[PDB]
Structures are given as C-alpha cells and as structure tokens.
C-alpha cells in the first residue's frame, strides 16, 4: 500500500482536472489504509445512490463531480483526524520528537555530552554503538526524572567504515497511524537538524570548561582569556539564535494542528513547521554553514590548547593562538558582513553583536 | 550541582538569614521547612531534600563572639535551617587568628554537607568586608577553600562598606581582605552601604534605621541574582554558564548591581531596560566604560519584543562602553513566582563588569595610604603585632590592589591585548 497506487496523467481525461482526481486519490488511499489492518457509517449505498443518480444524467457536469468527491473527501478526513489526534494523541508525540531530535531536553543532552565525552571523541568502530546507548541510558537516569516506558522508543545509531561524534544518528520508532505522517524521509530531515544542534551545544559546554580553568588559576593565561572570551561571544549568540526559532516555530506548529479538524491541515502544519525550522538554522545555505562550522572547529583546537596545561604555554601554541585570534577575527567579521528573505530573527540577531559595534568599528 | 552558602560574621549572618527567609516565602516552604499546602521550580540546587518535605537549605552559619546568632536561633525559622552546624575582635588579624584555631571543625562542617549532597559546585559567601570578626576569618576561610577544592569555584557577595567613613582600622581591614579576594576569589558581587543608603533616602524617608531596611534591598538583589538558577530556563541553567559572560578576566571579577523598579512595591521591556541603564537604578556609589553587561527580567514579558527591545536600547546607547572585551548585552528572562505579590508585573535586575568600581577600591586605598603614612592606627595590639611584626602583608596587599587598579584602567585603554 501507499505504492502501486498513483495517478496516470497520460490516461486522465482532459475535461476532468487534476485537482479533483487528487481528491479521488486521497479518499481512495485513506479508505485503503484504514480498510486493512482491521483483523464506517454506511453512506456506501447513499453515495452509490448519489453516483447512481449521477450515472443517469446524460451530460457530464464537472462541478457536480467536484462536489460529490469533496463531500466524500472531507468526511473521510474529518474522521481520520479524530482517530489520530484523540485516540493516538499527536501532541505528545511531537513533544517527544522536539525533546530529543531538536534538543528540547537540556538537562539530559548536556549530561550525555558530559558523561560520554571521551568515547564519542574516540573514532568509530563496531562496538561503539552499544557503548553510547548504555551511556545515554545512564544519562537518562543521571537526570533522574524518569517515568515508565518513554525510553524504548529511542536509541543511538553509530555507523563505522562508511571522531565518533560525526556518525551519531538518532532514530524513533513510530506507530502505525503516524506512519504516513512520519515517513523515513522526514525523520531523515530531522536527523540533520539533530547533528547540527548537538554540535553547537557541545562547543558551548567545553568552552566554559576553559573559562572555569582560566578563572581558578602570568601572561599567556590572560591572552587565552581574551581568546576564550572573544570566542565565547559569538558562540552563545549563535545558539541563542537557535533558541529563538525553536520557541517561535514550534508555537506556530501546535497552533495550526489545533486550528481545524481536517487531516489535511495537520499535514500542512508539519510542512510549514519544517520549512521554517530548516531555514532559520541556515543549513540549506552553503557558505554560511561552510564558515560557521570551522568557527566552532577552530574553537575546538583553541579549547584543547588551554586544556593542555595550567602552566603558561609558549611552546609553539602562542604562534598559532595569535594566528587563531586573527583568523577568528577575520571570519566572524566576514559573517557579520553577511548578516548585515530579510527575516526578523536573522537581521535582529546582528545588533546584539552591533550593540558594541565591536567588529564594525574594527 | 548543589550550592552551599558560607554565611559568616554578624552582618553576613544577618543577610544570609534574610536571604533564606525570602527564599522560604518565594518557594513553597513554611517557617518549619515543611512543604506548603497551598503550592515548578528547581529547588534541588539551593535546598536539601529531607524525606518529610523539610526543605532545609545548605546554610553554614559561623559565629565568632556571637550576639546576633542567638537572635537568629530564637526565630520561627530556626527549624527551617536545621543542619546543626553552628560552631562557637574588631580587627582583621584577630578574626584571622581566631579562625585558625577552629579551622578543622568548621572545615569538617563543610565536609559533612559536601558528602551529604549528591554533588557540590560553588561556595557562595555572605562576606562582610572590614566586618570585624567577619573580615579576617572570611579571608582565611577563602584561602582554605580553594586549596581543598581546586576544581571548585567561590562566589563572594561582598557588602563593601562605605558609610561616608565607627572602625578606625577599616581601611587596613578592607585592604587585607581585597588582596585575599583578588587572588583567591573566583567571583565577587559588590554592594555599597552608601549607595543603598542613598537609595533608601530616595525611595523612602528612612535614614536612622539604615542597616535594618537596607537588609531588604540587599536581599532582593541576592534573590533576583539567583532566580534564573532557582527556576528552569533555556540558557544559564547553571551558575558557571552564567558567571562566564560576566567575568572576562579573572582579576576584574567584581560585579555591579541595579534594579529597574527600585519601588517594586504594565511596563514593556524597552521601558525597563532603558530605566535600568540610568544611574539612579544603579546601586553602586579619563574615559570609563563597562566591560560586559547582562540583564535578567522576570514577569509578563512579550517574546517578539525582547529582540526589538535590545534593538531599541542599542539605538538609545544609554550605556557607554569601548572595552577590550567583545561581550555585548543580551536580553535574558526568568520566571516570576506565584503566591507572592506580582506588583510591578515586569521587574528586572542587571549585573555588569564596569570600571568605576576601581574608584571605590581606590577610595579605601587612599584612606589606607593616609592612615599608613600617619601610622595613627597600626593598632599595636599584641595580637596585631605578634601576628604581623613586619606589617608587610599590608604592603603586599597594597601592591596587589594597585595592580588591580592599574588593570582596570588598562582595561579602559585600547590595548588590554598587551600587558595588564
């Protein structure tokens, strides 16, 4: 099912439009889908009596043919909404997706990065998959808030032979009524957002470990501190831009879910949610994603260098720390020029940093 | 991790007493520590959990020549603070020498709460600068805690004494405390008795009972500075993640305060930030500039206007800065609590690194410098002289605070990339 059933456009009569046949397709796919897996107010004969009467008419009229199929289109979609949103409540399911794919659980995902830091750092190999799941299971009980089940609908998937943080995919187990709403393709698009959001979440925590090291302790500590705090500014600013979209777009999504009792709006609700969620993250645009990542990656190499010693390090690190503070100053001002659809979230994020005019005055 | 607060000295025990009473009223806690029947907060960090809902805070009360501590004990709230951890001069040297003999038992009192908690991150000291018994003992305890807990971090809610300048050895005492705090304090939040007194004259007619009423002002600052930890949120869900933005350089770890409705007994976010940047709301008494500014708002705040509000504050340019530090102001938000009055429905506070606190350090250094040339109060008491025959710890403290003053003005300079 949901396959071997499709429009054939070349055989479609010209006076019959494509839109009405799409409604025909929808009511057919719906009544097929909840027809099987059974192991229904009977307007089957009255709609037959409608279609028997429509057979007796000599002349083809389109607006009557549109009216009768859209009557059967709305009646099947009004039910299939009511079965899905009430018996198999979607609002709880979308909450679990945001909590784990979109990092909505902050206590757990920060503790999982904290507890499993070394073993995700180590390169991938076939036995690393069970290791990160039991630590994620330990992270679930580290943040002791734990109900019953809630946990066997989620696991971690590492892939090896085709830095274990790079191959860290999250996957959810969907039920049958939500299997058309959640195909593998959309959870695949959910997967790229999960890898990006956990990256910037990782950078913020270990940078504050550099701050915490620097404050418990000459010169060359107080040059790292400049380099730490210069990198700290744009790092908390970028995640705060991601804070703004995840609040604003998810409030939009739940609202058009509850807007009407049509199943068609529920599908269009989820399409409007993802298109804005991908856009404000700027991940579909190439050069901004291809420059913000190395901003985090050069900060990883700086944060390793300060983590090397509490003693002052001019053993070839001050050579490239001065390279780093000039290389970071260049690219962060380069993205500041790029930030300066004209979306309110992207354009107003600038004059956070322009409150000091700090990169512009330079 | 859970926070243990080390309230010490008479004034510090007063403000810790009032701080925990305010958090009793603000959270769902009765004066006996019981969960309130009328009652969504993160009470784990600040309040230990007993089994029958006795929310006893992790307060460590130290008394030395105790008077106000007996008054603390005869209170309705004496059952609320029950970890049973109270263990029995006006000179810094007397307070230090008195702390040295009882250091092991008071440190075992530290150790017991450290073991009893699941975890421990910070030691938040209700310290009194030049506070007689409080100063000296607070500096010695500050010096012990970073050695015993090197990974851990120590905050100091210093009530820096300015009373228009009675203690005649007050600049000497404050001078020694500030050296201990600059090398051995991870963070310091500064407060001023003159600035709180001028605010007392502003908002009310209170002049003679200045201390008792300023306790409430200090306590409002102290609760609102921790509300974003005590209540869950998106960002600054831990102390160290908060303190990172406020302190860019470890020598300048000193933080100013302010509150938008000083008379907190509808206002939009643009209005409250603009009111906050004005100097009347500030509670602290050559170019000069902030290094970094942060703000937290609690109340009926609209979300699409907070970004536009910081846009409007940026257009206003009411706060002036050109530091070495790049940290720009951010609009943060916390949860206003229920059951207590929601008057001034939107209400906020600021914490900032600003170079004008170096002037107030330099004021007690100037008083110390004139007193040090006069030698009018070297005290020459046998405690003071037998503890410091050389009297050179005052000179080491003078050179360390002079480094701090020069570091502040070098942070004002365009080149703090170089040597500060």
Residue numbers in the entry:
A (entry chain K): 253 to 291, 300 to 422, 448 to 502, 509 to 631, 636 to 657
B (entry chain Y): 3 to 41, 45 to 93, 101 to 177, 180 to 279, 287 to 306, 313 to 447
Task: Provide the authors' original text about this structure.
The gamma-tubulin ring complex (γ-TuRC) is the principal microtubule nucleation template in vertebrates. Microtubules are formed de novo in a process termed nucleation, which is spatially and temporally highly controlled by γ-tubulin complexes, composed of γ-tubulin1 and associated γ-tubulin-complex proteins (GCP). In most eukaryotes, microtubules are templated from a preassembled γ-tubulin ring complex (γ-TuRC) that determines the position and direction of microtubule growth. Here, we used cryo-EM to identify and characterize γ-TuRC assembly intermediates after recombinant expression of the complex, which allowed us to delineate a comprehensive stepwise assembly pathway from a stable 6-spoked core to the mature 14-spoked γ-TuRC, identifying successive stabilization and conformational locking of γ-TuSC units as central principles in the assembly process.
Upon recruitment of the terminal γ-TuSC unit to the GCP2(3)-facing side of the assembly intermediate, the conformation of the γ-TuSC(3,4) unit is locked in a manner similar to γ-TuSC(5,6). Different from γ-TuSC(3,4) and γ-TuSC(5,6), the terminal γ-TuSC(1,2) unit is already integrated upon its initial binding in a conformation that matches the structural organization in the fully assembled complex. In this new, ‘locked’ position, the γ-TuSC(13,14) unit can directly bind to the γ-TuSC(1,2) unit by virtue of the MZT1-GCP3(14) module, which stabilizes the γ-TuSC(13,14) unit on the complex and thus may prevent it from dissociating again. This indicates a two-step mechanism for completion of complex assembly and ring closure, involving first, positional locking and, second, stabilization of the γ-TuSC(13,14) unit by γ-TuSC(1,2). In the second step, γ-TuSC(13,14) is stabilized by direct binding to the γ-TuSC(1,2) unit, preventing γ-TuSC(13,14) from dissociating and at the same time physically closing the ring. Formation of the lumenal bridge specifies incorporation of the terminal GCP2-GCP3 unit and thereby leads to closure of the γ-TuRC ring in a left-handed spiral configuration. Structural features of the cryo-EM density indicated that all GCP variants have been incorporated into the complex in the correct order and that the lumenal bridge was formed correctly, including stable integration of actin and two copies of MZT1. While the MZT1-GCP modules may play a role during γ-TuRC assembly by providing extended intersubunit interfaces, we could observe these modules not only in assembly intermediates but also in the fully assembled complex, indicating that their association with the outer surface of the γ-TuRC is not merely an effect of an incomplete assembly process.
